[PDB]
């Protein structure tokens, strides 16, 4: 057995180039640069192997930020042009990530404003968006679908007899809940009304659905768990009771259903069995908004605070203070928490810092964004933008990529 061996020269020499390429594909960018300068054959293996193209492709496959910029900048056109093009492209992407991260930290952004032009009862209670459209629920009882690029209104969906308070859509249906106490199912392509669920005794304040099941919650203090075999075949599975006031928000995954209420509590339920698990206490007033994913629950309250919780032990990991009014909507991803308040203000929080108990409180709010003139009812965001809607009857697109 030889003591040392040049794997990257030896493998291509015996006709096993792909194994040598696979070894180098594990390298980070800087180590790939180092491998380039080892010797001429190492350089040839990385170059003939298109290792820089493969590194960018691996990042697009595993990072939504890289994936998003591949689509937005247009160099994803070339993925899935010589090797040197991708080697020169990689630092351009890095600085493009750093300019975006700086824009979030400093709040440099462009702004698009949609005036929903509500004739009588003004306000946009809920929204969801993709690259093509923004679907919005309004106090005038309609759902308006806007073109993400031209900002024009493409479809108005009518049928609810009260405000559209909550909505979610996938590639097949839009599902909405309303002050009229009904849940309605619409064809996301044509807008045709497909189903109406009569069940709740009071306004349907929130809903989520995924993978054939849906949870709805209501001012009637109950949660309903539904099985959806199809847009037209939806069966009530269980009714969860235990909240002592209106249930303002519900979220779930395969492990748990998470609900929050005017009764100042978050309640955790087993998704499989619909059995109660635990109550999260801590907020001093009712809870207005919530998001749950993995082990993290983030909630906003009438007490003007945001709380981070671990779902398994129920511990509150961090209290976020700073909002001057009721925290009305909240979302988070892997990097940030974005929240909106009754005073029209939006705040961006450093989630990694917030989950580190060593970080001081003053370093947690990255920025405050003030462009709404009324209560912020709903927001959704990603690596590049925030989309928010308000009582002021506008939808705002905050774009942090210039």
């Amino acid at each position: 057995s030889m003591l040392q061996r040049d794997f990257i020269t030896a493998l291509p020499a015996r006709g096993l180039d792909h194994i040598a390429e696979n070894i180098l594909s594990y390298l980070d960018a800087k180590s790939l640069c180092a491998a380039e300068l080892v010797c001429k054959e190492w350089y040839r293996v990385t170059s003939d192997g298109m290792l820089w193209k493969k590194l960018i492709e691996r990042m697009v496959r595993t990072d939504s930020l890289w994936r998003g910029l591949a689509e937005r900048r247009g160099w994803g056109q070339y993925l899935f042009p010589p090797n040197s093009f991708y080697r020169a492209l990689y630092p351009k992407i890095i600085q493009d990530i750093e300019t975006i991260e700086s824009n979030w930290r400093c709040g440099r952004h462009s702004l698009q404003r949609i005036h929903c032009r509500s004739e009588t009862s003004k306000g946009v209670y809920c929204l969801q968006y993709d690259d093509q459209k923004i679907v919005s629920g309004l106090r005038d009882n309609t759902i308006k679908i806007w073109d993400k690029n031209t900002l024009e209104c493409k479809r108005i969906l009518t049928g609810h007899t009260g405000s559209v308070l909550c909505l979610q859509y996938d590639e097949r249906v839009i599902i909405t809940g309303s002050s009229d106490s009904t849940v309605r199912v619409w064809d996301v392509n044509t807008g045709e009304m497909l189903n109406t669920l009569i069940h709740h005794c009071e306004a349907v304040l929130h809903l989520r659905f995924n993978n054939g099941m849906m949870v709805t919650c209501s001012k009637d203090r109950s949660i309903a768990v539904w099985d959806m075999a199809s847009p037209t075949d939806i069966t009530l599975r269980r009714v969860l009771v235990g909240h002592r006031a209106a249930v303002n928000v519900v979220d779930f995954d395969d492990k748990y259903i998470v609900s929050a209420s005017g009764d100042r509590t978050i309640k955790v339920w087993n998704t499989s069995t619909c059995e109660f698990v635990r109550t999260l206490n801590g907020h001093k007033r009712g809870i207005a908004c919530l998001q749950y994913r993995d082990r993290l629950v983030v909630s906003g309250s009438s007490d003007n605070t945001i709380r981070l919780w671990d779902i398994e032990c129920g511990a509150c990991l961090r209290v976020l203070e700073g909002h001057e009014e009721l925290v009305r909507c909240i979302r988070f991803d892997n990097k940030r928490i974005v929240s909106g308040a009754y005073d029209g203000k939006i705040k961006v929080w450093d989630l990694v810092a917030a989950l580190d108990p060593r970080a001081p409180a003053g370093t947690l709010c990255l920025r405050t964004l003030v462009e709404h003139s009324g209560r912020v009812f709903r927001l959704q965001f990603d690596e590049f933008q925030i989309v928010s809607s308000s009582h002021d009857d506008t939808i705002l697109i905050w774009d942090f990529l210039n």
Partner: peptide
């Protein structure tokens, strides 16, 4: 309060 959320008051 807006129609989307409600407190625990009577």
């Amino acid at each position: 309060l807006d129609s989307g959320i409600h407190s625990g008051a009577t």
